């Protein structure tokens, strides 16, 4: 009962390679699995991984005891200046288990209690923003829930203030980040990396880790010494021990988990807050609804911890932006032992899986005949939803740490976004899918006209 598996086409002694030297790969291969189905195979000079789209499929490559996280080559790349922090380690280093037990507390729905107020000043900054536009004038969205989001983990995270608001061109350090995410990308599609024509990126790539590093660095050392208390992310670390080998993180692993929260939530929190919005101009009666929630529950000048909680159409608008284009689109996995997925395909272990999410999320045997249309209701009773059917944030052990994070800001800035503001898609946006890292709608602008509600 062995099944041979789809395969797409080949470019000879490059096998499938060339199908990922493209602008959107990850389009590419969802119009793949269209064509092929649940699973297919992929190949490229020296490795082969095999593509799962099904839930019927994926809920096995989500069982632990058989498969775990594998670092992707773009992983790999990101490892060059995130190091061994938590989302470019494999699970088998110390230093994975060490940081994921002190880290975990911090991260947790009730730890989000204490950062709402930080998440509240930046989300008023952007509040201001937009209050302050001239009639003539329009939104740039994803770049303000860009440096929302980055402001915001900045602030929560350690203290810092990036102050992107105040800014046309971003913080030296951010400069430095998104030009190391850029280049570690970039690696993927470099047929030869040690042609002259690279030597400019190699000396700017070892420019930005240094950036990075200082100043990462300085805030450590600067916190160590003065010695405040505080409960951020960065106290945590430098005050909390593994429970497991009761040791604490060193401070170079400090540095790399500060720079992993920055690459790691950025792009997808700002991401999803930008399809979020991209849904709700494109369906009107869903933003009406979600406005009457936002107008109903959120009372008071400034948003509480409690009334986010109350935000439950706003939560579910989120989850319908993360079904359709989960901003983290795919993840990657190998066999622990050998084994045979799905009664039918034989694995060998160390072979790799992808799971494909936003192939997963359109799987019409969970979501019916409709999984193309915007309809946040369908999350109103989740319990209906089958194990492995809705994966945004991973799995398992290795799951996103940032989850609540991530959604209590979402929650909070589209809730408040919905209250103050009135929305306009302007020039009829027309969808476009930029891929790096991540996945965000490139171009869209909307006009906003202020409710006239204060602050
Ligand atoms: C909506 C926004 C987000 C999405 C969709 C998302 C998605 C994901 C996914 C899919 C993974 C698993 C990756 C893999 O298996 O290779 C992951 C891991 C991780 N994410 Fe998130 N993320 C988001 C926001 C955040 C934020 C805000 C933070 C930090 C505050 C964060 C920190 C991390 C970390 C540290 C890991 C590695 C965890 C571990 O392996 O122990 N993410 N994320
Ligand atoms: C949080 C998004 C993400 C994406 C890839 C690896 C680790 C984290």
């Not at 989000?112 to 201001?128: C, E, N, P, S, T």
């Amino acid at each position: 009962t062995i099944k041979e598996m789809p395969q797409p086409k080949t470019f000879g002694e490059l096998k499938n390679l060339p199908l990922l030297n493209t602008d959107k790969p990850v389009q590419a291969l969802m119009k793949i699995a269209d064509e092929l189905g649940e699973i297919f195979k992929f190949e490229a000079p020296g490795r082969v991984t095999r593509y799962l789209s099904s839930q019927r499929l994926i809920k096995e490559a989500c069982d632990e005891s058989r498969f775990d996280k594998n670092l992707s080559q773009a992983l790999k790349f990101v490892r060059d200046f995130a190091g061994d922090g938590l989302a470019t380690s494999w699970t088998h280093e110390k230093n994975w288990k060490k940081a994921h037990n002190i880290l975990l507390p911090s991260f947790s729905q009730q730890a989000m209690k204490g950062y709402h107020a930080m998440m509240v000043d930046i989300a008023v900054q952007l509040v201001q923003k937009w209050e302050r536009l001239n009639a003539d004038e329009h939104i740039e969205v994803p770049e303000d829930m860009t440096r929302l989001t980055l402001d915001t983990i900045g602030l929560c995270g350690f203290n810092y203030r990036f102050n992107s608001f105040y800014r046309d061109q971003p913080h030296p350090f951010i400069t430095s980040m998104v030009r190391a995410l850029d280049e570690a990308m970039n690696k993927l599609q470099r047929a030869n990396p040690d042609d002259p024509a690279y030597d400019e990126n190699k000396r700017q790539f070892q420019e930005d880790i240094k950036v990075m590093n200082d100043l990462v660095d300085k805030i450590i050392a600067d916190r160590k010494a003065s010695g405040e208390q505080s409960d951020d992310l960065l106290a945590h670390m430098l005050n909390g021990k593994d429970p497991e080998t009761g040791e604490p993180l060193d401070d170079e692993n400090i540095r790399y988990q500060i720079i992993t929260f920055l690459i790691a939530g950025h792009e997808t929190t700002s991401g999803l807050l930008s399809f979020a919005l991209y849904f709700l101009v494109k369906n009107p009666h869903v933003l009406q609804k979600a406005a009457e929630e936002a107008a109903r529950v959120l009372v008071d000048p400034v948003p509480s911890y409690k009334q986010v909680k109350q935000l439950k159409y706003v939560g579910m608008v989120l989850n319908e932006a993360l079904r359709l284009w989960p901003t983290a689109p795919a993840f990657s996995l190998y066999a622990k032992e050998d084994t045979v997925l799905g009664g039918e395909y034989p694995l060998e272990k160390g072979d790799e899986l992808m799971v494909l999410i936003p192939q997963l999320h359109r799987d019409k045997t969970i979501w019916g005949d409709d999984v193309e249309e915007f309809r946040p209701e369908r999350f109103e009773n989740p319990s209906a939803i089958p194990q492995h059917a809705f994966k945004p944030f991973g799995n398992g052990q290795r799951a996103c740490i940032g989850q609540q994070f991530a959604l209590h800001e979402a929650t909070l800035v589209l809730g408040m976004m919905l209250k103050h503001f009135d929305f306009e898609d302007h020039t009829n946006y027309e969808l476009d899918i930029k891929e790096t890292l991540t996945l965000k709608p490139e171009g869209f602008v909307v006009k906003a006209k202020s409710k006239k509600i204060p602050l």
